Design a protein around this nucleic acid. Structure first.
Length: 436
DNA sequence: TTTTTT
């Protein structure tokens, strides 16, 4: 049933619904034929999950490789996250015959760099096959679900939403799930509910899953934050049909801008959310907008993230990073994006001699684009100039506030800029040149 | 305006 292993190195796709067997059954079949298999997964929870399942399901203790915990058993199957894979240097000479890229539809930097690395080191490593497994191929669109009944929202309702209202009796009793775009509107909405008799509790990254009651009537308002360690299954799911993402804009003022905004969810999103209800029973799905953007497209800012991570985390020179990205972009059947490898690569090539300390701090702070952020901070300090603003993303310069004066040597725009700006800095001029 | 992985 699983894609046969060819004589020479080949790259094969694998499209199947109900993503689950592709990462358990499939890898198990191959191993039965005396094959060495590596199953890459974006999630750490999943990577760990599969490890325990394979044991009881196929009597085999797979190898587990994640950032946190690592387990070596010597078995023919190895489960790992893309992050950990990259951190290990990528494909190890002669170690696997088959490399499965699970959830290859994921358009996040870590997955993309990971997949791009496998497509570039697989053959030379000895692998005889690479499987790009996913349940939602590029161009997918939400399809009706058996145990789920989707109902739109109208003006009618005592709870204002994102252009519509939500009938109080709709969530009056039972367990329901409400998806909001921001973490602040989650609390705001939980308020208008909790202080209205209803037992509502907001959830998002940073909070503990225990906050949500295992049973009883409850209205959970959360973000797309995973509820690791919690079994979903809600009576109904109300979705705002919007996501918060980062997009690049070549605003030439003076260079580029990476802004974070909200955008109508795509198929994969509308599906994942709607999928939290209708498990082993009849569920409902209330939305604000019917339409949906076809999956299979990510923004150029994502490519920018890959170079940043390659510089901040995986010790990859811009050039090196371009090799792996190029392979990913040269392989059909994967999410597409404007080819800006040359541009992004040139930009990072000029960001040399960053401050070790600053880099460390932005990385430790878990800030997006730690390299770009740390580099801007590096330039500012090096010019005794204040940062673009004193927003939490520049806290690595706080101790230097007293001696920082004048305009900020703006290299690019990563959010709001409250301080006065200059554009005379050589690095700004270099990046201005790359825009051409 | 979020999440996730190094």
């Amino acid at each position: 049933s699983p894609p046969a292993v060819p004589q020479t190195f080949q790259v094969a796709h694998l499209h199947a619904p109900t993503g689950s067997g592709k990462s358990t059954k499939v890898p198990a079949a191959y191993a039965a034929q005396g094959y060495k298999v590596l199953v890459l997964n974006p999630s750490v929870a999943a990577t760990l999950g599969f490890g325990a399942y394979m044991s009881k399901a196929h009597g085999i203790d797979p190898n587990i490789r994640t950032g946190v915990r690592t387990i070596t058993t010597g078995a023919p199957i190895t489960y790992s996250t893309y992050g950990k894979f990259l951190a290990d240097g990528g494909c190890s000479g002669g170690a696997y015959d088959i490399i499965i890229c699970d959830e290859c539809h994921s358009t996040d930097s870590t997955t993309i760099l990971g997949i791009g690395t496998v497509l570039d080191q697989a053959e030379t490593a000895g692998a005889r096959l690479v499987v790009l497994a996913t349940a939602t191929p590029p161009g997918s669109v939400t399809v009706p679900h058996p145990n789920i009944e989707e109902v739109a929202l109208s003006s009618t309702g005592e709870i204002p939403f994102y252009g519509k209202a939500i009938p109080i009796e709709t969530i009056k009793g039972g367990r329901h799930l409400i998806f909001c775009h921001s973490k602040k509107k989650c609390d705001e909405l939980a308020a208008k509910l909790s202080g209205l008799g209803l037992n509502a509790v907001a959830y998002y990254r940073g909070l503990d899953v225990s906050v949500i009651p295992t049973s009883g009537d409850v209205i959970v308002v959360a973000t797309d934050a995973l509820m690791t360690g919690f079994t979903g299954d809600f009576d109904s799911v109300i979705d705002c049909n919007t996501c918060v993402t980062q997009t690049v804009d070549f605003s030439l003022d003076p260079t580029f801008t990476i802004e974070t905004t909200t955008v109508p969810q795509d198929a994969v999103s509308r599906s994942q959310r709607r999928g939290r209800t209708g498990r082993g029973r009849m569920g409902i799905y209330r939305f604000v907008t019917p339409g949906e953007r076809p999956s299979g497209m990510f923004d150029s800012s994502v490519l920018c993230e890959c170079y940043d991570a390659g510089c901040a985390w995986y010790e990859l020179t811009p050039a090196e990073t371009s090799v792996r990205l190029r392979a990913y972009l040269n392989t059909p059947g994967l999410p597409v994006c404007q080819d800006h490898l040359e541009f992004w690569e040139s930009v990072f090539t000029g960001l040399t001699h960053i401050d070790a300390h600053f880099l460390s701090q932005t990385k430790q702070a878990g800030d997006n684009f730690p390299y770009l952020v740390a580099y801007q901070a590096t330039v500012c300090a090096r010019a005794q100039a204040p940062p673009p603003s004193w927003d939490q993303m520049w806290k690595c310069l706080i101790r230097l506030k007293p001696t920082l004066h004048g305009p900020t040597p703006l290299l690019y725009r990563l959010g709001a800029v409250q301080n006065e700006v200059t554009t005379t800095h050589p690095i700004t001029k270099y990046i201005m040149a790359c825009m051409s």
